[PDB]
Homo-oligomer: A and B are copies of this chain.
Amino acid sequence: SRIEALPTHIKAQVLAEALPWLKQLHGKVVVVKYGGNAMTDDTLRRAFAADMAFLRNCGIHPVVVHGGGPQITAMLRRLGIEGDFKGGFRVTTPEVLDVARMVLFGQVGRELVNLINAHGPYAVGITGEDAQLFTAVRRSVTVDGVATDIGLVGDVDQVNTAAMLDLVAAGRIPVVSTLAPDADGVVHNINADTAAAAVAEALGAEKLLMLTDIDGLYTRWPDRDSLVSEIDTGTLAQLLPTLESGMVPKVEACLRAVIGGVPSAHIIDGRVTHCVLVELFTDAGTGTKVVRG
């Protein structure tokens, strides 16, 4: 607000210090997993949508992957669809998937498309179903020590890398809803964190960003001194069995992406307005960067 009280010779140096990162990312793919409160608060949402327009007006190629777990389960309760739970996991019947698909693609992805498109004709929504852009393989879960079927849920199988980069080269910002047909054409819901890692690897992304609701990776949570800002995958992979259940899907995504050759994956604070801008164009990022090693 009263940000015009800041001298203009510091506004300059802030912009000038973005240049090495503008160079690094010019012409490159950046996959961004969008979820958490950055998806539930209107100020953060509009900032996120603005940053995706920012990237695109810098000649950078963002790709957005979104989840929406809580919204699926609220729609299920509204429809009075009673759940079945093996372990702590709801079974995804054909009925639950139809709901998941409708909610993610026809509600959650729509709002991000319209927000982004307020800045131009950039956003385009899609699932693996569209133009056979990617496929799924059914995933089983292990629960208290036995692999068990929990329905139409899976992992990304193959990605139409060629068709996906045409879409980006045409200046579009794909907004991906993670549903995809298996080899027999039956559609599965895919965890959005792991989908983002698979997409970032298939597209040769320069960075994977994971918006989450924390400052960054704590090693010995909740010691404040335990927070790290850069970590290699070797050290990170062995720290995995210690962290909170909320953190593991995000860490596995970064591990799988960086092992797959994406140069860096980042876990950043989605509660921070314009967190994408601070992580990419500033050395004052709060997140933690994962590199190979």
Nearest to A117 among chain B residues (CB) is B132
Please give, as numbers and ranges, the residues of chain B lying within 8 Å of A131 by CB-CB distance: 117, 121-124, 172
In Å, the complex CA distance between A125 and B12 comes to: 28
- State whether B130 touches A15 (Cβ < 8 A): no
B15 and A14 within 8 A (CB): yes
Interchain CA distance A117-B142 in the complex, whole Å: 33
A residues lining the B interface (CB < 8 Å): 3-4, 6, 8-19, 22-23, 26, 47, 50-51, 53-54, 57-59, 78-80, 98, 101-107, 110, 113-114, 117-127, 129-133, 160, 163, 166, 170, 172, 181, 185, 187, 272-274, 277-278, 281-286
Given known A3-B13, A113-B129, A113-B130, contact A19–B124 (CB-CB < 8 A): no
CB-CB under 8 A for A12 and B53, given A106-B105, A110-B105, A124-B130: no
What residues of B have a CB within 8 angstroms of the CB of A286 in the complex? 8
Q: Is the CB of B102 within 8 A of A114?
A: no
Query: A117 and B129: CB pair below 8 A?
Result: yes
Q: Are A54 and B132 in contact (CB under 8 A)?
A: no
Q: Which residues of B contact A127 (CB under 8 A)?
A: 110
Q: How far is the CA of A103 from the CA of B101 in the complex (A)?
A: 10
Q: Check if B16 sits within 8 Å of A47, measured CB to CB.
A: yes
Q: Cα distance A57–B98 when bound, in Å?
A: 30
Distance in angstroms between the alpha carbons of A106 and B123 in the assembled complex: 17
CB distance from A28 to the nearest CB of B (A): 11
Are A120 and B23 also in contact (CB < 8 A) when A106-B102, A113-B130, A125-B130 are?
yes
Contact present for B16 and A15 (CB under 8 Å)? no
Q: Given A106-B105, A278-B11 in contact, is the A123-B130 Cβ separation under 8 Å?
A: yes
Which chain B residues border A160 with CB–CB below 8 Å? 121
**Are B15 and A274 in touch, CB under 8 angstroms?**
yes
